Amino acid sequence: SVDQKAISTIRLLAVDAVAAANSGHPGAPLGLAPAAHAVFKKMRFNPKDTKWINRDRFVLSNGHACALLYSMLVLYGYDLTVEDLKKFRQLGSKTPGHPENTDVPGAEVTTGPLGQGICNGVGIALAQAQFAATYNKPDFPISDSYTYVFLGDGCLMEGVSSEASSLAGHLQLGNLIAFWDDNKISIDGSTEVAFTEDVIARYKSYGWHIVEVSDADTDITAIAAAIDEAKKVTNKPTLVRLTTTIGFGSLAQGTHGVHGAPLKADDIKQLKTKWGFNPEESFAVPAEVTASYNEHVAENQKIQQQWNELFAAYKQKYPELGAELQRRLDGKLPENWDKALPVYTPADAAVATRKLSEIVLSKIIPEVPEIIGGSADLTPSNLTKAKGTVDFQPAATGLGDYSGRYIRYGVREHAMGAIMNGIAAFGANYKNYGGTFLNFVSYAAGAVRLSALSEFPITWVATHDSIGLGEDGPTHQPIETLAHFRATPNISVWRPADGNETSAAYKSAIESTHTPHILALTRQNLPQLEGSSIEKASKGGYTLVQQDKADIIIVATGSEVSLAVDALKVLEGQGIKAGVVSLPDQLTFDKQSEEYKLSVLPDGVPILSVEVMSTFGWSKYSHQQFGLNRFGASGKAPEIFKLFEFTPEGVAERAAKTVAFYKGKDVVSPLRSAF
Amino acid sequence: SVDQKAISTIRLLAVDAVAAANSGHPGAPLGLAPAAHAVFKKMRFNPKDTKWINRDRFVLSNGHACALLYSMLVLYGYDLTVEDLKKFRQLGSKTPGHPENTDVPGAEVTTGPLGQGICNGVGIALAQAQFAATYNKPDFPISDSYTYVFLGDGCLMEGVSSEASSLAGHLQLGNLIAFWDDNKISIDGSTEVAFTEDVIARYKSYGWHIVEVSDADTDITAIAAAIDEAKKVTNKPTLVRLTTTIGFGSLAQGTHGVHGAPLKADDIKQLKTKWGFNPEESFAVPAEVTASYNEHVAENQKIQQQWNELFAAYKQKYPELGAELQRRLDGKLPENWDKALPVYTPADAAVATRKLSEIVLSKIIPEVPEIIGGSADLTPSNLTKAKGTVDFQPAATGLGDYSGRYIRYGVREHAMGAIMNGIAAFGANYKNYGGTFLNFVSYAAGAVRLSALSEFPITWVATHDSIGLGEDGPTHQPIETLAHFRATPNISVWRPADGNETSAAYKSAIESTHTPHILALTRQNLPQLEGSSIEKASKGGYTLVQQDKADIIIVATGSEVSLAVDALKVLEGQGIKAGVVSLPDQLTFDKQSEEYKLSVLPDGVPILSVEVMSTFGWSKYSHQQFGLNRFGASGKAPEIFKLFEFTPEGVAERAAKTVAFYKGKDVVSPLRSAF
Ligand SMILES: Cc1ncc(C[n+]2c([C@](O)(CO)[C@@H](O)[C@H](O)COP(=O)(O)O)sc(CCOP(=O)(O)OP(=O)(O)O)c2C)c(N)n1
Ligand SMILES: Cc1ncc(C[n+]2c([C@](O)(CO)[C@@H](O)[C@H](O)COP(=O)(O)O)sc(CCOP(=O)(O)OP(=O)(O)O)c2C)c(N)n1
Ligand SMILES: [Ca+2]
Numbered sequence A, B: 001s002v003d004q005k006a007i008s009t010i011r012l013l014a015v016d017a018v019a020a021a022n023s024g025h026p027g028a029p030l031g032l033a034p035a036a037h038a039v040f041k042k043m044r045f046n047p048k049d050t051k052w053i054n055r056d057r058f059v060l061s062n063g064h065a066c067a068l069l070y071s072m073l074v075l076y077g078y079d080l081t082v083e084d085l086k087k088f089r090q091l092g093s094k095t096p097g098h099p100e101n102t103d104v105p106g107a108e109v110t111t112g113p114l115g116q117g118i119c120n121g122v123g124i125a126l127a128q129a130q131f132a133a134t135y136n137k138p139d140f141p142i143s144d145s146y147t148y149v150f151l152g153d154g155c156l157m158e159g160v161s162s163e164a165s166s167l168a169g170h171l172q173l174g175n176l177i178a179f180w181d182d183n184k185i186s187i188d189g190s191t192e193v194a195f196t197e198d199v200i201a202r203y204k205s206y207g208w209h210i211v212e213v214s215d216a217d218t219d220i221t222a223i224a225a226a227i228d229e230a231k232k233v234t235n236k237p238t239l240v241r242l243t244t245t246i247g248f249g250s251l252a253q254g255t256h257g258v259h260g261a262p263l264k265a266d267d268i269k270q271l272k273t274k275w276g277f278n279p280e281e282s283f284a285v286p287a288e289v290t291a292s293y294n295e296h297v298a299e300n301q302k303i304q305q306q307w308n309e310l311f312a313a314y315k316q317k318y319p320e321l322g323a324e325l326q327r328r329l330d331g332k333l334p335e336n337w338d339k340a341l342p343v344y345t346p347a348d349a350a351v352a353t354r355k356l357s358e359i360v361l362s363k364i365i366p367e368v369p370e371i372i373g374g375s376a377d378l379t380p381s382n383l384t385k386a387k388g389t390v391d392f393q394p395a396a397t398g399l400g401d402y403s404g405r406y407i408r409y410g411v412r413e414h415a416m417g418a419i420m421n422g423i424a425a426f427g428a429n430y431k432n433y434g435g436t437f438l439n440f441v442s443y444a445a446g447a448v449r450l451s452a453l454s455e456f457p458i459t460w461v462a463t464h465d466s467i468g469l470g471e472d473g474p475t476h477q478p479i480e481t482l483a484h485f486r487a488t489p490n491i492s493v494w495r496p497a498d499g500n501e502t503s504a505a506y507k508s509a510i511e512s513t514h515t516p517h518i519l520a521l522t523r524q525n526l527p528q529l530e531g532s533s534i535e536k537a538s539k540g541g542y543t544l545v546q547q548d549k550a551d552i553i554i555v556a557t558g559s560e561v562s563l564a565v566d567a568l569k570v571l572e573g574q575g576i577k578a579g580v581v582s583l584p585d586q587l588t589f590d591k592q593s594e595e596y597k598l599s600v601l602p603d604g605v606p607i608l609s610v611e612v613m614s615t616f617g618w619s620k621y622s623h624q625q626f627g628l629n630r631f632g633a634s635g636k637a638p639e640i641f642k643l644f645e646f647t648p649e650g651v652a653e654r655a656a657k658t659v660a661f662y663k664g665k666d667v668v669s670p671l672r673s674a675f
């Protein structure tokens, strides 16, 4: 049959790709080829339009199996060829060793770190439900797509997938259909050594529907039927148990050895001969298979053509919603949306930046429908919900609706991070956010790093940023956290000092298309600064207090900018003239012109940094660094600041020592370097 | 009854502590006081000897409820008083806002970050099982203790607890007894908004035993009976469902408001009056309660007295095992154990540091019985198992035994990290380790940071440290990871360059008593260096190649030390004389004398760092930094190094530019500072 030939083609493309690289993972591709064939036949997609908003999405959560994904994409005529497969795992190729959404056409997300993809699928499905609830009308099914996820035993062991699966079950996400590659093998051998739980019983406990396919090595009829069954269960996500043989067909099938290394050449020969292929040929693509796959593409393209006409008719009947939808699909925010951002003056009261953040969200959520977000069980602490909005919940619960805009993530930071990545991956200009304490963003590092690598414009609303939180103590107080994320490529880490800077931080976060944002926000009140503005703070770093005859410049962030300003006054009494720089985002600052950066951090003057966290990174911008490189303490916050000498007098003392240290020395900007 | 009076005393101490601080969490302490009373009555412990090795352990995983724990410890006469309770959450007190093992007598571990404590309890129970299997003999129950854990809904939502609970069920840890505070309230309100899974069904799916206590607000008889029942089930960990009212007794009981803020003064008055206490009095301790608790302490002390005699008789009957046990309880490694560390010369072959690590483990595991460890499903990749050792498994499985020394953690990095903390917390000199790829240590950041704060000598065997891993690509290649952990207080981050440095890294990791270690190890082969030794590498940083007329010093780590040595030769052809410093651990180096450090990084010479990861931190040790501050690539590793110019010629070019940049400038050691 042509179906059998397609499955063999997929298997052998994957095996040949691994062989050519002499690197990679043939086992799961061999075991999952029947399921991949069956699922892609059911999926609606256009290889010539990867961004069609009503496509079904596929996610390979077991990303090491990517030779399988690449084979599917090649066979279906995505912008990926057999020549690209021949360059699997080679420097600069479109077929990297794990899938990357930036590099691989048809890769929705970046996987390889286990557990992430299933959570991303939960986010894609969450977004689809929210999107459909927002736009669909009678006779206008603008959004009705499914989210298909493959995952393995490793993904099921990772706690992040438990978090997302509990939440997905709670959210009754009926358009999510996940497939477990039940092959009883991981790197350390049999799952009997470490993973003997009743997975199916666990998934039932989350409120998932289950379909079991006992012979997923061959029974594509049953896999197709499982999809049909899952589509009938509209109020539960479905887990399809695919009982497979890892490395099916290999001499080494059913062993850990077939997981992660190239097959022996003689093994590949016997694979080919028993499936009717030429053992002397590699990268074979039978034209029958191409033809069959092209038929399905042509049908899908006619479906998209009809969808485009549905969308045109929608814009006629619902002109307001239609224009909104068009704008979002064009990747554009509402015209002048940023006029809603709050602006402050130095005459306004002190406000904590967590509260300033609440106020921003309250103003911009009504203006920008593509903003949705939530908190990991810290809503009244992070202040992440705009009053009068509705929670994202299935209406059956009575607790919200799918048109809602506020997500109750529960105590699930890591899954929140990966779900945010999925919401961004859905597209339609979603600008989504997630609240927790800054110190517990670290629980989600696996996902945060992938936000950066994947270039997704997600936002962490990361409150309680420092020892300023006080009594909860050192288990809650960040030290290393900003250094960690600033050291990660492509993360904007905003630490706004006041009202105007907080609005600039949100302007950046919402306008972002390729850079995730972390907004480090305070528990404690901070004054409105003389000299701040959205305009200046949007440069990432700016001169707050200019002093043309400066003996020293103090560069600071967040809560320490006000401290620097108070230190300037103490220094004046000591006969020392200081300037102050505010550096609310180091990444945005770094991206400014060299001349702009030098105007902020000039040659010929010592520069002292002040920030109540790690000094790592700060030598980019300063000659000396006053930071906190030990754990915190449990007490009233002002007493902790006093203990560590983060006081106007403590800063002034260190500034004076810095001036003295450079007396008689030639000083050049920290921005200068040898290469 | 005196039991009722004790429960009221506990509740009111907790409430009064929160009131005095005007900060903290009264809800869970009110709800869990009956269970705490019942559990502590069943527990064997000595308040005057917190380290008795056969004590039952208690862990408060819902660490925000620590006013409850502190109240128990005070009532039982630990080294914690009512005067300390009056200083709850105050700077410098012994009653911080979350429990810290370093500061609080009777706090086994540091909790507050949700999910950690239950995992720590899994580790304490794992250690107890391994310890008992190692030492117990007929008529000599040296170890027979239980591990009691309280946890809440937040802990159950955190994925780390799912990981550890799956593993604990697999491991049949019958001496683990956990209690879920089933109060249906978290910070965002009812658990109906985010947490509607069938928890009990999930725990059954892991292989746990369940006991339900439907009225845990009052039914201490049933709580005691649940413990007795759990003790009869010797091959399953038990979850006891405690259905409680959060804030029981408060006017605001059963609401999120009672979770996390002080009660109103009038509320506290009515609590006191209805429980028979004086509403005008705070911190009341009825002498009846003290007496009752003292009876139980006296009985426990007689049990420990008898245990000491059992131990003396054990040493007579089993002199070898007895001496080993004594040595371990004294906190001492075997005399001259380090003579087993492998030593290399420059004539020996190149070896990857992952393989050098395997060889070290193979030599030291037979010499040091208190070493146990495992891998998160990367055993044949991390090379963490010594040939001929047995896995830690219940004997019923046929796959290992509790006397085993190698743990199959599965794909569970975060739980592995927290379980390691529990194994360390058990005591008996356990020196335990966990393998994964360095990039996925980040999945466990929540636990790693707590290793540092808790001062536990755990070790991560963190292989595949860089772009040197090659084809798996940027989702696997660390960039930010060393900077993150180096920026965390109290983490030794070893990146050994060769055989001798790898032995020094293990010497440090195994000798540690208060500092967690991460060993960053290579996939790829590295040469044995001329000038390396265990002695010199044990200083953390040392001069590898001394050049008395150096134009530049190159400081490097790990795989980049050999690169620096090759660059020195290129530079010689350009007329530039270089020295080389190897910096295998920045923390150990920092702890050396100022004079020693200056001998390695002197004044008067430019210093260039080379390490294929983030440049953050490196300005502590260098004037210019050559690092990698972008994500990696999927390709053959040497091609990636060439792409990024981490080649002898690329390093030499940057060294020459550094020399030129400082021509005519006065250069002082990067170790100098203004304050
Ligand atoms: C978060 C996390 N932890 C560990 C891994 C490591 N790991 C993964 C990889 O990294 C591939 O993605 C490794 O196969 C590396 O390629 C090996 O590197 P070398 O030893 O050749 O140098 S895959 C994996 C477990 C696979 O178990 P599964 O049951 O999920 O998959 P299958 O049924 O065996 O196909 C495990 C445990 C990961 N990818 N993500
Ligand atoms: C990993 C992690 N994530 C979030 C939290 C935050 N959180 C915790 C805390 O941090 C205390 O430990 C917060 O109560 C902060 O003290 C609040 O700070 P402010 O707003 O007053 O400034 S507790 C918690 C959820 C509690 O749900 P549970 O059901 O576990 O506990 P209970 O039955 O309500 O007692 C949640 C969600 C955490 N501790 N650990
Ligand atoms: Ca598997």
Ligand SMILES: [Ca+2]
Binding pocket: B152, B153, B154, B181, B183, B184, B185, B186
């Ligand atoms: Ca609760």
